[PDB]
Amino acid sequence: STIEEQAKTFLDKFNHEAEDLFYQSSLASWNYNTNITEENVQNMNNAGDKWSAFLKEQSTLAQMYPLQEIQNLTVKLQLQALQQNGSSVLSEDKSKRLNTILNTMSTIYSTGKVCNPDNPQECLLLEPGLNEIMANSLDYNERLWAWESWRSEVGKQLRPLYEEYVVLKNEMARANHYEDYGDYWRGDYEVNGVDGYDYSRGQLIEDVEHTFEEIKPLYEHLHAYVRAKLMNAYPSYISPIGCLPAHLLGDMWGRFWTNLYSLTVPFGQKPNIDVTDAMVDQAWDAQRIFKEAEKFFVSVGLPNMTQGFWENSMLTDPGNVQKAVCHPTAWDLGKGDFRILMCTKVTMDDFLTAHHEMGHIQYDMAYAAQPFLLRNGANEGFHEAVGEIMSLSAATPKHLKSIGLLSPDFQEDNETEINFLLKQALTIVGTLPFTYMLEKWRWMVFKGEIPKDQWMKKWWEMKREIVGVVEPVPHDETYCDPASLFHVSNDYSFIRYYTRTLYQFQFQEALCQAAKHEGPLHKCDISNSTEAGQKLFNMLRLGKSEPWTLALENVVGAKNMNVRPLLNYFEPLFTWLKDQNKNSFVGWSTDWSPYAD
Amino acid sequence: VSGNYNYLYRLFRKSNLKPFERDISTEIYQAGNKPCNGVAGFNCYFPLRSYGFRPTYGVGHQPYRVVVLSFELLHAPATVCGPKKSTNLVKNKCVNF
Numbered sequence: 001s002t003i004e005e006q007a008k009t010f011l012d013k014f015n016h017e018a019e020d021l022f023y024q025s026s027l028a029s030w031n032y033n034t035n036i037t038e039e040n041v042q043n044m045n046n047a048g049d050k051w052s053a054f055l056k057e058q059s060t061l062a063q064m065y066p067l068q069e070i071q072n073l074t075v076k077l078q079l080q081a082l083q084q085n086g087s088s089v090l091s092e093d094k095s096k097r098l099n100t101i102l103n104t105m106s107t108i109y110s111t112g113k114v115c116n117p118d119n120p121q122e123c124l125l126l127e128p129g130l131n132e133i134m135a136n137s138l139d140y141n142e143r144l145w146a147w148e149s150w151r152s153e154v155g156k157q158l159r160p161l162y163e164e165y166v167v168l169k170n171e172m173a174r175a176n177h178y179e180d181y182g183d184y185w186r187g188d189y190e191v192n193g194v195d196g197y198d199y200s201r202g203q204l205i206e207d208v209e210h211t212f213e214e215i216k217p218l219y220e221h222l223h224a225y226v227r228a229k230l231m232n233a234y235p236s237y238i239s240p241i242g243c244l245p246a247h248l249l250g251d252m253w254g255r256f257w258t259n260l261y262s263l264t265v266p267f268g269q270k271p272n273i274d275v276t277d278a279m280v281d282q283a284w285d286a287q288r289i290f291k292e293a294e295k296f297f298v299s300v301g302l303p304n305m306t307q308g309f310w311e312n313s314m315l316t317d318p319g320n321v322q323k324a325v326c327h328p329t330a331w332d333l334g335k336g337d338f339r340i341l342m343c344t345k346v347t348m349d350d351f352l353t354a355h356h357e358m359g360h361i362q363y364d365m366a367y368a369a370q371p372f373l374l375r376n377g378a379n380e381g382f383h384e385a386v387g388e389i390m391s392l393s394a395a396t397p398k399h400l401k402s403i404g405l406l407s408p409d410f411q412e413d414n415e416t417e418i419n420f421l422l423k424q425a426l427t428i429v430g431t432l433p434f435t436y437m438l439e440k441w442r443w444m445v446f447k448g449e450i451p452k453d454q455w456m457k458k459w460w461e462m463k464r465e466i467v468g469v470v471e472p473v474p475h476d477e478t479y480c481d482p483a484s485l486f487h488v489s490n491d492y493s494f495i496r497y498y499t500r501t502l503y504q505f506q507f508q509e510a511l512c513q514a515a516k517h518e519g520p521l522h523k524c525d526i527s528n529s530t531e532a533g534q535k536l537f538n539m540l541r542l543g544k545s546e547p548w549t550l551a552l553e554n555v556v557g558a559k560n561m562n563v564r565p566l567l568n569y570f571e572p573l574f575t576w577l578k579d580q581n582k583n584s585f586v587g588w589s590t591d592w593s594p595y596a597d
Numbered sequence: 598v599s600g601n602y603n604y605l606y607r608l609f610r611k612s613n614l615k616p617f618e619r620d621i622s623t624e625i626y627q628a629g630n631k632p633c634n635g636v637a638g639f640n641c642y643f644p645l646r647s648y649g650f651r652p653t654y655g656v657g658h659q660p661y662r663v664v665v666l667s668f669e670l671l672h673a674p675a676t677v678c679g680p681k682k683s684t685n686l687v688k689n690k691c692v693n694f
């Protein structure tokens with residue numbers, strides 16, 4: 001009864017019950033996901049309902065213990081995570097209104113239908129075909145149509161709903177001593193009073209705007225190259241001092257330039273590394289690939305699979321007609337019962353996805369000792385970060401020719417290396433300007449700086465200034481372009497895909513500087529080492545029990561995200577791009593327009 | 598499967614036990630300062646929970662069975678001892694018996 005002994009003794013009970021219930025819920029869910037029937041939806045909805053009701057009751061009960069009389073750090077962190085009101089601080093009818101606006105937004109996004117002006121009877125959804133038209137077509141007219149349509153029919157309906165959504169979320173967040181909603185998102189990177197490891201909610205914006213400054217020397221050259229290359233497929237449509245038209249990037253919103261590899265390959269007659277026929281000519285099943293992944297993981301010094309994962313998991317899609325959503329996922333039903341749900345085919349891409357998923361499996365195996373409320377990554381970003389380095393280290397030619405899938409006399413050269421590096425940088429450094437731009441735009445519109453009659457003009461001037469792309473058609477203020485992105489119209493945070501891109505290469509360099517590697521970083525492997533495994537595992541097992549700025553400094557040695565490893569990873573590509581642009585004009589002028597000529 | 602809620606295990610008590618002692622009470626715990634009067638809720642917790650076992654658990658959570666033996670010689674001089682066995686008997690030979 002030491003004013004705190006009450007917190008501990010509460011916490012225990014909670015712990016137990018929580019864990020148990022959660023498990024019930026989760027088994028239920030895995031079920032429905034692996035065997036789609038009509039009754040299983042009911043078997044899982046009530047389990048989720050009971051879990052949610054229990055958690056909200058415990059949250060309403062935890063309030064009775066003040067948060068300044070606690071002295072131990074871990075119990076304070078657990079209470080601070082549980083004591084969160086979340087929603088339901090609003091007026092009751094406004095809560096239902098918020099649920100309605102959210103669900104209506106999600107539905108209007110999901111079931112969008114756009115139809116041709118030449119044939120309005122049968123037409124296209126978003127997922128089947130629209131992405132294919134925007135990715136694989138090659139005529140300017142069809143791309144411009146597919147681009148303007150989706151923003152003229154799904155951008156116009158969403159604005160009068162997003163307007164109310166903003167103010168409702170702001171009034172929600174403003175009851176928990178917060179000043180807007182964006183702060184309620186940045187609050188994930190917050191650390192209070194640990195004598196030096198503190199990280200104020202504000203300094204996240206400072207880091208982001210301070211690390212985006214060092215990327216531009218590389219992004220500018222990449223933009224110049226991609227532009228001078230796109231000036232071949234569509235002759236006399238781009239200006240050599242202008243920006244790019246949004247409907248030429250490779251998808252609906254311009255998030256990944258990966259589909260531009262067909263037009264901008266450096267050496268179009270030297271094929272890259274690809275183990276796809278060598279696999280099937282060796283009769284590899286879904287079992288063999290996972291055995292290879294586990295062998296690689298155990299080679300570095302991590303434990304085996306739990307021997308309950310080989311009988312329960314579903315590695316190959318069920319033969320008969322058994323509807324199960326084929327989207328890879330790593331389940332941690334808790335209680336040490338880990339599973340992997342994915343419809344593996346015999347392709348090297350699935351061979352890399354297996355590694356990327358067993359990464360999450362290992363990361364979940366590590367921290368299974370912490371209290372139940374601390375079973376996550378250090379923040380939202382570390383999870384996929386620690387996941388992706390396995391795929392980045394398993395795709396190098398060394399690890400391939402050491403497993404029996406490449407001819408021993410396969411000799412790699414600098415041409416194939418530049419090819420691979422551009423294929424990588426079309427995805428890694430390509431999405432960063434878009435990500436930072438969209439997140440800054442959302443923070444701005446939430447804090448109230450941008451008046452609600454200047455949304456689209458500000459968004460497009462930002463697309464002109466930062467990322468270097470220009471709209472093809474004018475858009476007045478009956479539109480809303482950002483509401484046409486999945487992570488926006490569904491109330492999903494969108495800054496993790498910018499911190500992950502940095503944490504990735506920081507982890508890569510920090511780790512395989514212990515494997516005593518000597519060459520460029522893009523050939524670096526973490527196999528056969530034991531110091532690397534220990535350095536990684538001394539962070540994998542913390543969970544949330546320590547501030548993330550300590551989880552970093554125990555791996556790389558710094559107390560923040562630094563972009564230098566990224567540039568050090570791309571240095572060869574940068575040396576090449578500095579030569580292939582001796583005659584073009586780097587950068588872009590925000591005056592050019594595709595219609596004002 | 599579905600949970601076998603028979604086996605309980607106490608996780609609230611005033612002070613730790615004594616060796617070889619046994620406690621089976623079901624008096625509602627009291628952590629706060631206000632007496633409970635035998636009603637669960639705020640700072641009045643039931644003292645017994647149950648292991649919910651299922652076949653799809655990992656090692657370290659599946660039910661193990663434990664037995665322990667303990668000897669003590671209060672003073673007995675000829676109690677239960679170990680056993681013995683065979684060794685072919687012969688006759689008409691000088692032998693060590």
Ligand SMILES: *[C@@H]1O[C@H](CO)[C@@H](O[C@@H]2O[C@H](CO)[C@@H](O)[C@H](O)[C@H]2NC(C)=O)[C@H](O)[C@H]1NC(C)=O
Pocket residue numbers: 035037039
């Ligand atoms: C997928 O779920 C369905 C819905 O229950 C299962 O179908 C029945 O499941 C019960 C459960 O024991 C069986 O007794 C019936 O014989 C099943 N009937 C049919 C027509 O399937 C189905 O078995 C589940 N699939 C798997 C692989 O377990």
Ligand SMILES: *[C@@H]1O[C@H](CO)[C@@H](O[C@@H]2O[C@H](CO)[C@@H](O)[C@H](O)[C@H]2NC(C)=O)[C@H](O)[C@H]1NC(C)=O
Pocket residue numbers: 008072073074075
């Ligand atoms: C209160 O904080 C202390 C340390 O500040 C925690 O002590 C650790 O407890 C764990 C198990 O709970 C042990 O494995 C560690 O060895 C302990 N650390 C030290 C330095 O002895 C203590 O657990 C915290 N209280 C609670 C309820 O978690």
Ligand SMILES: *[C@@H]1O[C@H](CO)[C@@H](O[C@@H]2O[C@H](CO)[C@@H](O)[C@H](O)[C@H]2NC(C)=O)[C@H](O)[C@H]1NC(C)=O
Pocket residue numbers: 063064083085089175176177
């Ligand atoms: C969470 O919401 C509650 C309202 O439901 C806020 O108000 C506190 O509510 C608790 C119990 O419901 C009271 O004991 C407090 O006196 C209330 N006022 C406070 C704590 O200032 C509560 O403030 C909200 N949580 C936070 C962290 O602000």
Ligand SMILES: *[C@@H]1O[C@H](CO)[C@@H](O[C@@H]2O[C@H](CO)[C@@H](O)[C@H](O)[C@H]2NC(C)=O)[C@H](O)[C@H]1NC(C)=O
Pocket residue numbers: 414415576
């Ligand atoms: C890949 O490596 C080869 C050999 O190391 C390079 O070939 C030489 O490149 C320099 C660079 O200007 C030229 O001056 C030489 O004339 C090249 N050698 C021959 C025999 O012609 C090649 O350039 C490298 N690839 C790239 C893209 O630079």
Ligand SMILES: *[C@@H]1O[C@H](CO)[C@@H](O[C@@H]2O[C@H](CO)[C@@H](O)[C@H](O)[C@H]2NC(C)=O)[C@H](O)[C@H]1NC(C)=O
Pocket residue numbers: 299402403527528
């Ligand atoms: C690095 O790891 C690989 C993976 O096991 C080890 O590969 C073995 O290498 C020896 C000799 O090079 C071969 O005889 C074995 O057949 C290989 N094993 C397999 C499964 O292919 C390699 O030994 C490790 N490196 C060192 C220095 O021990």
Ligand SMILES: *[C@@H]1O[C@H](CO)[C@@H](O)[C@H](O)[C@H]1NC(C)=O
Pocket residue numbers: 298303304
């Ligand atoms: C992992 O499993 C293999 C089975 O092939 C076994 O030989 C090895 O000893 C196991 N290692 C550990 C650490 O459990």
